């Protein structure tokens, strides 16, 4: 029981020299999300290939702060012509997470069911036009040459609350048909959820679509019965400490901290 991870590592210490918008697409979407316990190196989301990130945690385990930090890491690497953000943030805890330059030109800040439903519907209209022509080869698919512009990051905090306040259409329904092609259309969802509701979320048509197709999942503090798993290690942890699960492996990390606005 020697303690290898810091209790707090600032984003700037985790990511002191981020590459900038002049780098290629793959470099710009290798996003650091925490410090590895095994060798004290940064763990990365490979978002040029695996587009999403899921963040599950008990109350005050760091969900919103970590979402804020990872958003800033993405903006350090990408110009407004390379990424735009749409926020679902009913508690308004992420309003300054993204510089204004990097917000989507309209529908960017959604703090209730009515606004989010309108914004997501409009986003789906635009993203649907990026679906690839059926005859594209794998090489053409990977080149993403048939559309041009920014990737979109759909930054979603407190998904359990969004689902809980959902009046009418289940939230994100216009995007559900587009999720299988998310990598091809430049869509990234980064979603936090309270752990007491994350297990059921992994079966739904938004968080559960991403989870079921192998999105990296960060398990912050939680109780064992909230996410039954013999493979994952869900237990109480200090804020920011997480069991990260991805198709590449399973490992304990310390997720980046950033000061609140």
């Amino acid at each position: 029981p020697v303690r290898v991870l810091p209790e707090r590592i600032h984003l700037h210490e985790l990511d002191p020299n981020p590459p900038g918008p002049e780098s290629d697409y793959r470099t710009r979407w290798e996003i650091p999300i925490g410090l590895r316990e095994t060798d004290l190196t940064p763990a990365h989301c490979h978002m040029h290939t695996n587009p999403h990130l899921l963040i599950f945690g008990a109350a005050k385990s760091g969900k919103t702060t970590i979402a804020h930090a990872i958003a800033r890491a993405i903006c350090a690497r990408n110009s407004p012509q390379q990424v735009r953000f749409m926020l679902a943030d009913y508690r308004s805890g992420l309003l300054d997470a993204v510089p204004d330059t990097h917000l989507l030109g309209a529908g960017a800040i959604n703090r209730n069911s009515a606004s989010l439903d309108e914004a997501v519907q409009a986003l789906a209209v635009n993203l649907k036009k990026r679906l690839p022509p059926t005859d594209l080869t794998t090489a053409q698919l990977r080149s993403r040459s048939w559309w041009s512009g920014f990737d979109v990051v759909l930054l979603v905090d407190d998904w359990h609350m969004i689902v809980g306040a959902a009046g009418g259409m289940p939230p994100m329904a216009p995007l559900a048909p587009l999720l299988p092609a998310a990598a091809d259309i430049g869509l990234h969802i980064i979603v936090t959820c309270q752990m007491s509701q994350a297990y059921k979320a992994t079966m739904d048509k938004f968080v559960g679509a991403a989870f079921g197709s192998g999105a990296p999942t960060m398990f912050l503090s939680g109780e064992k019965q909230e996410f039954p798993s013999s493979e994952f290690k869900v237990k109480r942890r200090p804020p920011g400490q997480a069991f990260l699960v991805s198709p590449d492996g399973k490992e304990v990390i310390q997720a980046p901290y950033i000061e609140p606005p």
């Binding site: 309209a106 519907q121 409009a122 209209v125 635009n126 512009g149």
Partner: peptide
């Protein structure tokens, strides 16, 4: 109310 339905999606900068 045709221009109206696309008044949001047409202004997102795509």
């Amino acid at each position: 109310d045709e221009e109206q339905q696309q008044a949001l999606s047409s202004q997102m900068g795509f």
